Amino acid sequence: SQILSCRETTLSMWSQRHNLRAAGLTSADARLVQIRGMLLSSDIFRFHRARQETLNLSTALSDLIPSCESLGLSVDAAIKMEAANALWDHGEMISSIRMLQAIDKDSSLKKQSVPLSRSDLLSKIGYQVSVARLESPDAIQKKYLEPALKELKGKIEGREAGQVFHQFAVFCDEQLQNPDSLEDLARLQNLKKGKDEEVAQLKHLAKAKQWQELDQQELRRVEQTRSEFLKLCIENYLLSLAASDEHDNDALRFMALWLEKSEEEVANEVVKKWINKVPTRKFALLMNQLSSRLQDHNTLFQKLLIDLVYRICVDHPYHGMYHIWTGARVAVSRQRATDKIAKALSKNNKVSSIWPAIDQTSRVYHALAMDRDPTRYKSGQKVPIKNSPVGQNFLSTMSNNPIPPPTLQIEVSANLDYSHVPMIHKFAPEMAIASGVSAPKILTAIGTDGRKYKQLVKGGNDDLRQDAIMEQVFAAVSELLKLHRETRQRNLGIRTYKVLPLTSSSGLIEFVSNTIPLHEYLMPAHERYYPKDLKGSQCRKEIANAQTKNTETRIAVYRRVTERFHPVMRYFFMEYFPDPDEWFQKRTNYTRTTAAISMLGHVLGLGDRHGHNILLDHKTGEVVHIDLGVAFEMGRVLPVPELVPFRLTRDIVDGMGITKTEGVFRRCCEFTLDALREEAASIQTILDSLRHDTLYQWSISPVRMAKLQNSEADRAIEVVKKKLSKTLSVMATVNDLINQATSVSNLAVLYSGWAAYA
Numbered sequence: 001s002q003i004l005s006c007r008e009t010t011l012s013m014w015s016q017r018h019n020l021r022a023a024g025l026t027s028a029d030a031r032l033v034q035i036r037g038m039l040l041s042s043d044i045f046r047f048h049r050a051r052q053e054t055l056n057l058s059t060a061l062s063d064l065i066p067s068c069e070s071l072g073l074s075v076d077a078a079i080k081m082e083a084a085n086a087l088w089d090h091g092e093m094i095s096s097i098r099m100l101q102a103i104d105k106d107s108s109l110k111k112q113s114v115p116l117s118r119s120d121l122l123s124k125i126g127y128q129v130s131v132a133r134l135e136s137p138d139a140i141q142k143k144y145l146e147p148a149l150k151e152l153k154g155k156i157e158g159r160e161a162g163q164v165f166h167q168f169a170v171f172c173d174e175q176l177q178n179p180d181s182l183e184d185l186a187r188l189q190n191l192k193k194g195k196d197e198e199v200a201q202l203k204h205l206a207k208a209k210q211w212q213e214l215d216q217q218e219l220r221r222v223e224q225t226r227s228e229f230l231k232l233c234i235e236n237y238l239l240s241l242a243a244s245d246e247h248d249n250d251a252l253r254f255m256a257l258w259l260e261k262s263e264e265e266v267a268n269e270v271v272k273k274w275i276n277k278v279p280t281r282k283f284a285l286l287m288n289q290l291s292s293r294l295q296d297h298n299t300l301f302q303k304l305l306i307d308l309v310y311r312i313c314v315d316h317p318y319h320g321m322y323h324i325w326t327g328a329r330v331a332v333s334r335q336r337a338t339d340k341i342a343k344a345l346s347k348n349n350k351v352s353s354i355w356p357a358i359d360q361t362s363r364v365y366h367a368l369a370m371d372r373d374p375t376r377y378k379s380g381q382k383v384p385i386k387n388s389p390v391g392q393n394f395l396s397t398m399s400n401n402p403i404p405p406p407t408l409q410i411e412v413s414a415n416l417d418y419s420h421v422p423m424i425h426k427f428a429p430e431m432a433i434a435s436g437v438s439a440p441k442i443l444t445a446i447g448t449d450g451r452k453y454k455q456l457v458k459g460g461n462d463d464l465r466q467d468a469i470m471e472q473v474f475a476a477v478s479e480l481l482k483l484h485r486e487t488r489q490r491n492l493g494i495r496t497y498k499v500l501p502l503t504s505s506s507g508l509i510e511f512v513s514n515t516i517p518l519h520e521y522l523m524p525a526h527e528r529y530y531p532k533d534l535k536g537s538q539c540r541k542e543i544a545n546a547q548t549k550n551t552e553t554r555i556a557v558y559r560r561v562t563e564r565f566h567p568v569m570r571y572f573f574m575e576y577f578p579d580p581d582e583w584f585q586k587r588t589n590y591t592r593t594t595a596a597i598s599m600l601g602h603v604l605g606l607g608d609r610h611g612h613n614i615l616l617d618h619k620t621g622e623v624v625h626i627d628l629g630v631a632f633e634m635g636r637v638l639p640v641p642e643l644v645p646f647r648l649t650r651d652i653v654d655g656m657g658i659t660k661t662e663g664v665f666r667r668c669c670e671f672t673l674d675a676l677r678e679e680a681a682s683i684q685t686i687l688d689s690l691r692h693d694t695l696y697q698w699s700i701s702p703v704r705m706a707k708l709q710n711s712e713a714d715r716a717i718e719v720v721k722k723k724l725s726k727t728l729s730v731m732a733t734v735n736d737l738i739n740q741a742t743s744v745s746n747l748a749v750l751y752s753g754w755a756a757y758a
């Protein structure tokens with residue numbers, strides 16, 4: 001605000017003082033520059049939601065119009081549009097709409113400086129008239145949207161056309177999923193059904209048949225209207241994706257809309273016509289959903305889907321070829337189709353030194369994962385990977401085939417240039433081993449640029465596709481958080497990692513760089529700082545013995561245990577960051593990331609939040625949540641249910657200081673939850689894309705349910721949708737959540753492996 005106000009003063013004074021200016025700078029030039037600087041400041045003030053400053057600016061701009069018309073400037077349209085924006089942002093919807101319509105009626109948008117295209121004005125009026133319900137959705141399309149598409153004049157590239165096409169596509173989509181129109185279609189369908197049943201009962205007949213035919217004609221009209229809307233929706237989504245990059249979650253919405261209509265040949269003809277102009281970098285992150293619908297059926301849907309998956313794997317190989325490999329090496333048809341795509345991939349010129357590399361490398365990674373020997377691999381040791389035959393074959397094969405580390409997160413390149421990606425140079429000679437049955441081994445790889453990429457080569461009978469899908473969903477929602485001022489100002493978001501499933505029994509997990517598990521810090525620290533307290537194992541055993549007793553005894557035992565167990569988390573920051581400046585910044589990072597993941601894991605039902613799934617990053621302070629596969633409330637179905645919204649035990653809360661909760665954690669919870677329920681449409685779109693994934697399981701299979709404690713899509717998405725309801729205020733919702741997350745009667749009846757005493 002300070003810089004922008006001083007800039008306003010500067011530009012106005014320079015425009016007034018004619019003798020200070022140079023020779024060839026007339027007063028029209030100074031005036032025009034002043035106006036442009038003011039309009040820029042108005043954009044900036046609008047995002048900050050500073051109402052009074054946009055009001056001041058638009059008033060001071062409207063006062064310049066008389067003195068601008070005498071200098072020979074035509075800046076009335078841009079300034080009146082700024083006034084209309086101020087009105088709309090103060091709540092005057094009808095006044096803003098009337099002002100924009102007056103701009104459109106009597107103004108020459110062609111011959112005037114500070115240009116203003118007629119199609120963006122028309123689409124602005126159309127958007128505002130739709131929001132205010134000021135006209136029927138059949139006149140909005142006839143007066144504002146189709147005239148806008150006609151004003152583009154065949155230009156199908158740029159941000160102007162991107163805005164127009166996204167406007168029109170969202171309008172048509174909104175017309176399809178309309179509760180009134182769906183009720184009307186259902187009513188006409190029941191009428192047709194009942195009248196046909198009555199006619200069958202009879203075979204009076206003449207009039208009955210005539211009424212039946214009139215019903216049929218009405219139903220044909222309604223269905224044809226819906227078919228036109230579907231055509232326009234799909235076509236304009238595809239044209240908006242091909243024009244600009246402003247709207248790129250239109251790829252997720254187009255994909256959901258197209259997978260719902262895989263049989264309606266109308267949709268497939270429109271897609272066939274327009275699909276080849278979208279850059280494949282828009283679909284690159286949707287390969288879990290695309291490669292799950294592959295089949296060999298010779299239809300048109302499959303001939304489009306297979307070609308799209310092929311082009312994605314050719315342009316961005318490190319984003320599609322592992323999906324193809326996993327798919328090759330209704331399940332039989334999917335495997336056959338993925339095998340055909342793989343055979344075609346190992347035939348073309350662009351990707352031919354890349355597909356064999358990934359082939360051989362994945363084979364040896366899987367072989368190394370599956371190889372368990374209790375003698376050759378002792379849990380906790382550190383074995384040089386040259387003594388097993390699998391180890392030597394692995395090292396040789398990896399030396400002969402250079403690839404980027406499979407757990408490195410590669411960003412998608414618009415220029416299609418993946419040469420700047422570090423390849424695996426060599427492997428560290430040894431590999432660690434963790435405790436389990438099928439020994440998870442932690443490899444290290446030294447890359448070309450000289451960094452160390454550690455990896456968990458996880459083998460056994462686990463399902464990493466759940467964890468990978470949920471990591472992708474959480475990353476998408478955290479990306480939604482960046483669009484709002486309050487959460488973006490605080491960098492509220494989650495830390496991601498990379499899961500890569502190789503087969504149905506093995507995967508590569510990214511070993512997060514310099515973290516430490518929460519339980520592995522907390523259990524030694526508890527006895528280092530309080531040598532007279534109970535041990536972690538004594539508390540766990542004491543709580544597990546009273547697991548088959550009444551709630552009164554369980555709560556009494558829990559109080560007795562936590563009276564002899566004091567939190568020590570506040571020391572994690574006093575012993576990794578002794579400098580007060582750094583200590584304060586890192587403790588704030590911890591609090592903010594804990595708040596963001598608490599709200600985000602309440603909204604998505606995230607469970608299984610024990611100490612071994614939470615990592616503490618001792619370089620930046622901020623927590624990382626891994627193992628995100630038990631989501632959508634699957635955790636309160638277990639034998640000993642997890643009935644808390646998130647993990648907020650005494651140690652998580654002790655890491656926050658004098659102000660236990662009231663402070664940074666509560667304000668950040670409220671900003672997160674306030675930004676989440678203003679993106680409920682986008683979260684619905686993400687979960688809808690999840691709904692068309694044939695391989696995602698919406699219930700926890702008794703295998704993992706036994707590994708954890710020693711329509712389902714419709715119910716889950718409905719629960720998510722009612723957690724984002726604006727009925728209660730954010731303050732009251734967060735108060736309730738923090739009351740039930742820290743309650744002793746809730747924490748006392750949790751499973752003993754969920755270390756709640758801690």
Ligand SMILES: Nc1ncnc2c1ncn2[C@@H]1O[C@H](COP(=O)(O)OP(=O)(O)OP(O)(O)=S)[C@@H](O)[C@H]1O
Nearest residue numbers: 434435436440456497509510511512517612613626
């Ligand atoms: N991707 C990862 N990055 C960094 N550390 C990890 C990662 N995955 C697991 N860890 C940690 O390294 C160890 C590996 O844990 P695992 O033995 O694979 O599974 P686990 O969670 O320990 O077993 P349970 O069922 O939870 S008792 C644990 O101490 C984890 O905290």
Ligand SMILES: [Mg+2]
Nearest residue numbers: 612613626627
């Ligand atoms: Mg784990």
